[PDB]
Design a protein around this ligand. Sequence first.
Ligand code: FAD
Ligand code: CL
Length: 488
Amino acid sequence: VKNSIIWFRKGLRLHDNPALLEACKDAKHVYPVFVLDPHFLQQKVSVNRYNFLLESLEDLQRSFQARGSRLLVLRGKPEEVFPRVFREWGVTQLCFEHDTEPYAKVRDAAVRRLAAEAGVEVVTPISHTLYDTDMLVARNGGAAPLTMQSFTKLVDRVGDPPAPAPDPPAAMPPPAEDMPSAAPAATGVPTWQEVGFKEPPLTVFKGGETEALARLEAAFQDPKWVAGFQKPDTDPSAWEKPATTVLSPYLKFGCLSARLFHARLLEVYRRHPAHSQPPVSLRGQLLWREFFYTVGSTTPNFHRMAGNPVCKQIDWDDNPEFLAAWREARTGFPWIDAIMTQLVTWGWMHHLARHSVACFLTRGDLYVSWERGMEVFEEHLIDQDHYLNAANWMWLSASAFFSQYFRVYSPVVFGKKYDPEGRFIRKFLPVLKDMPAKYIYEPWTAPLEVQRKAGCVVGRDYPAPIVDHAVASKACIARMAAAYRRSK
Ligand SMILES: Cc1cc2nc3c(=O)[nH]c(=O)nc-3n(C[C@H](O)[C@H](O)[C@H](O)COP(=O)(O)OP(=O)(O)OC[C@H]3O[C@@H](n4cnc5c(N)ncnc54)[C@H](O)[C@@H]3O)c2cc1C
Ligand SMILES: [Cl-]
C-alpha cells in the first residue's frame, strides 16, 4: 500500500499545492506534517511572527479536519524525527515544496539521504516562486540577471508562469489510527504561551490560508484599482486602510500562492488594456520578489557583506548608541519613531515607510551597517523573508542594485507630503497627539509654551533629535562618494 507524508515548511495552504496532490494520489494514508523545534527561543523572533505561524497552522488544521484528516505538528529536528516515522507509518513517498534558502538546501539534502536509506520516494515540486528559478538562470546563459529590466525581459521570453494546481479532493486519506508518534496530545498546534513567549502579540494581521484568500478577494473588489496600480505613487502614511495589498506575510509563509495571485492579475489585465506595466504594476511587484529570489539563491553569502560578490564593501560604523536609538524608536524625529513603532506593534510597514527608516540608519544619517538594521527587521517583521529583507537593505544602503547615494530622504519633509496633519504620527506616537500640525514633524522647533500646552516637552516626554539631518546627511554622502571610488 502507499503511505505518504506531506511535509509543510512553507506552502502552508491547500490550494495550488502539487506536493499535496502527489501525496494523495492512490494513497491509503496521508500524514500531513509540520516539524517544530521546541528549543527555539532557548537559543531573534518576535511573538508577532511566531503567532502568525501558529495561526496559519490552526487554519491548516481546520482544513484537514473538514476533509476527514488531521495536521500533525511533530516536535524535534527533522533529521531525528523522519527516520522514526518512516518505519512506524510504513512510508513509501515523501512530498514537500522546494525551498531555495541556504539552511533549507542543507536540511533537505539530509532528509533526502535518510529517505533513500528507508526506500522512500521524494517528490519536490516548485510552487513557492512563479517559475523554476534554476530554469530562469539556465535560460539566461547560466547566470542570473542583475537588473529588473533584463529580468523582466527574460520572463517575457520564457512566457507565462505555470497555472495554479487544482484543488485537493474533498476527502483525504486520514493518518492511520493508534500510531504512537501521531498521538493527538503530542501533535497538537501549541499556543504562543506554551512555546515560552511572555508578552502577547499586538499585530492586526491574522495568519492562515483562509485570511489570505479573503484579503486577495478584497483587493480584487475594485479591478480598476488593481489595473492602474503604481507602487511609487502609493501612500506610506495610510494605516486605517493600507495603500498596498498587505499580502507579504501570506506570500512569505505560503498561505497564498504567487501563481494564483499572478493568474488573477492576468484575468484583470485582459479586460483593462491600459493597465500598468512592470516594474510599478502589481504584477511587477511579484516580479521583484522573483528577481531577488533568483539572484539570491544563486549568489553565495547573499545575506552578508563579506564574501558577497554583489555587495559593495563599505566601512560602516560601529555605533551601538545610534543603533539603540533607531531600534527603540527614540531618534527625535517623529516620522522615524512612528514607523519603528509600527514595526514592533504590527510587524508590517508600507514599502516607502521601510525606505525612510532604512535610509536614515544606513547611508542617510547614522551610517550604521545595513546588516544591523536587517537583524532588527528579521526579529519584528511578520513578512520576514531571507532574500527579500537582504536585497532591499542592500538597495537602500546603496550597496547593490542601487547606486544613487545623492538621493537622501528627509526625515521631516517625506511624510509631510502625504500626511501634513500628522495623522500617522499621532496614532503610533500618542505623546504627540496634542501637538499642532505645524510642529509635529519638528517638535523641537515649537515654542516651549506650545510644548507645555500640548503636554509634550522635548527632552522630557519626547527626545530631542539625535542628529542634525543637514549635517549628518552631508557627512554620509561624502563618505559614500569616497567609498565608490576606492571600490573601483
Ligand atoms: C529595508 C527593506 C526590507 C524589506 N524586507 C522585506 C521582507 O523581509 N519581506 C518582504 O516580503 N518584503 C520586504 N521588503 C519589500 C517590500 O517593502 C514589501 O514586500 C512590501 O512592503 C509588502 O507590502 P505589500 O504586500 O502590501 O506589497 P504590494 O505592493 O501589495 O506587493 C505585492 C507583493 O509583491 C512583493 N513585493 C512588493 N514589493 C517588493 C519589493 N520591494 N521587493 C520584493 N518583493 C516585493 C511582496 O511579496 C508583496 O506582498 C523590504 C523592503 C525594504 C525597503
Ligand atoms: Cl524627501
